[PDB]
Structure formats: C-alpha cells, structure tokens
Amino acid sequence: VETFAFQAEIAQLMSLIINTFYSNKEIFLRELISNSSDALDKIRYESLTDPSKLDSGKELHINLIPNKQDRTLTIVDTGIGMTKADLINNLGTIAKSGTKAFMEALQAGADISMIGQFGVGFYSAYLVAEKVTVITKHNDDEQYAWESSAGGSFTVRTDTGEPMGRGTKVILHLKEDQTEYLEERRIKEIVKKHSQFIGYPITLFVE
Ligand SMILES: Nc1nc2c3ccccc3nc(Cc3ccc4c(c3)OCO4)n2n1
Numbered sequence: 001v002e003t004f005a006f007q008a009e010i011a012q013l014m015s016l017i018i019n020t021f022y023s024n025k026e027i028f029l030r031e032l033i034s035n036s037s038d039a040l041d042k043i044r045y046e047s048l049t050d051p052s053k054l055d056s057g058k059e060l061h062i063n064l065i066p067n068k069q070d071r072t073l074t075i076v077d078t079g080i081g082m083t084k085a086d087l088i089n090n091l092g093t094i095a096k097s098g099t100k101a102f103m104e105a106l107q108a109g110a111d112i113s114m115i116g117q118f119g120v121g122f123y124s125a126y127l128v129a130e131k132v133t134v135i136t137k138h139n140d141d142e143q144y145a146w147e148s149s150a151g152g153s154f155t156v157r158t159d160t161g162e163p164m165g166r167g168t169k170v171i172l173h174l175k176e177d178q179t180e181y182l183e184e185r186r187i188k189e190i191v192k193k194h195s196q197f198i199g200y201p202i203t204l205f206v207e
Contacts, residue, residue, distance in 0.1 A: 039079025
C-alpha cells in the first residue's frame with residue numbers, strides 16, 4: 001500500500017467540490033458514465049488495428065450496481081482500464097490544466113454541473129461519496145486498487161481481490177445523507193435525464 005499526495009490543484013478542486021453548497025449532486029452519475037463511455041471508445045478503437053486487445057473480454061458495456069448493505073454504488077465498465085502510471089502521475093498531470101480552467105470558469109459564473117467539459121468529471125464523485133475506491137485493469141499490466149477519502153492523499157496497491165479481465169470499477173462509498181442514489185427509481189430517473197444516448201448498454205442491477 002503506497003500513499004501519495006495529490007498535486008496541489010487537484011486537492012484544491014476536491015475541497016471545492018466537497019465544500020461548496022450545490023444542491024444538484026446527481027450529475028456525478030452522468031460524469032462517471034461519460035468517463036466509462038470514453039474508456040470503452042478507446043478500447044474499441046484500439047481493437048480495430050489489434051484484435052488481440054479484446055482477448056481480455058469482447059463485451060463493451062457498463063453496469064451500475066447498488067448495494068444497500070455496503071452503502072455503495074459501483075459503476076463498472078469493460079473499457080480500456082488504467083495503468084499504474086495513469087493512477088499515480090498521468091491522470092493528475094492531464095487534470096492540472098482542466099482544474100485551472102474549471103476554477104476560472106466558476107469565478108466567471110459557470111456551475112459545478114459543467115465540470116465534464118474540463119476533463120475532471122471524475123472528481124464530481126465527491127459530491128455524493130465520502131470515499132471512492134477504483135479497481136482497474138489495463139491489458140499487459142496488473143490489476144490496481146486506487147482509493148481516496150480526499151484530505152489531499154490517495155493510495156495505490158496491487159489488487160489481489162477478484163480478477164476483472166479488463167476495465168474499471170468505480171466504487172462510491174456514499175455519504176450518510178446521499179443513500180437516495182441506491183434507489184432503483186432514482187438511478188433510472190438520472191440515467192434517463194442525463195445519459196440516455198450513451199452508445200453502450202447500461203445495466204442497472206436491482207437489489
Ligand atoms: N472508467 C474510467 N476509465 C477511465 C480511464 C481510462 C483510461 C485512461 C484514463 C481514464 N480516466 C478515467 C477518469 C478518471 C480520472 C481520475 C481518476 C480515475 C478515473 O480513477 C482514479 O482517479 N477513467 N474512468
């Protein structure tokens with residue numbers, strides 16, 4: 001288990017997301033589904049020139065899995081997945097620019113719902129989650145668990161849980177007052193409103 005500090009701008013973004021009063025929290029789901037769809041586009045594209053990239057699983061899809069016992073909502077995709085270097089360095093590097101632009105736009109009169117336009121939509125998870133665990137597997141790399149409760153740090157470890165083939169699972173440990181996102185009716189409402197034209201099947205598991 002290695003512990004890392006977020007780069008300063010991402011820590012700042014996460015605190016803004018956690019601290020700002022903003023009632024329209026439901027947009028976290030559209031952002032994470034859009035991230036999954038982007039990951040799925042990438043593996044689909046890559047497989048056109050290299051068919052063996054789909055040996056780790058041919059099906060391209062998204063599952064949404066609520067668990068009231070654990071108070072988690074899990075978004076699973078079989079997209080391209082993330083490497084160790086993604087988790088520790090690259091994602092944070094790419095996001096440094098988008099954070100700055102987003103934070104400047106918010107001063108200009110934009111709102112938190114537009115986070116996705118700046119390539120940092122993942123961090124909207126913290127509108128609803130006290131902790132986020134990300135399990136991910138890229139071809140030719142090992143499976144990793146990334147985890148953060150914000151507070152300026154995150155951890156990465158080699159994951160020895162259930163092997164997943166290829167892709168990413170984002171596990172949102174929901175805040176005590178956000179359990180509405182475990183309800184079938186609520187998730188269905190949100191997917192229909194914001195994520196109706198995603199080009200991959202989205203399966204909403206029932207409890
Ligand atoms: N599902 C998924 N798949 C990816 C993905 C796949 C390949 C390359 C980059 C990627 N970035 C993100 C969005 C993201 C951003 C920061 C993160 C994160 C996911 O997980 C931990 O920190 N995601 N999210």
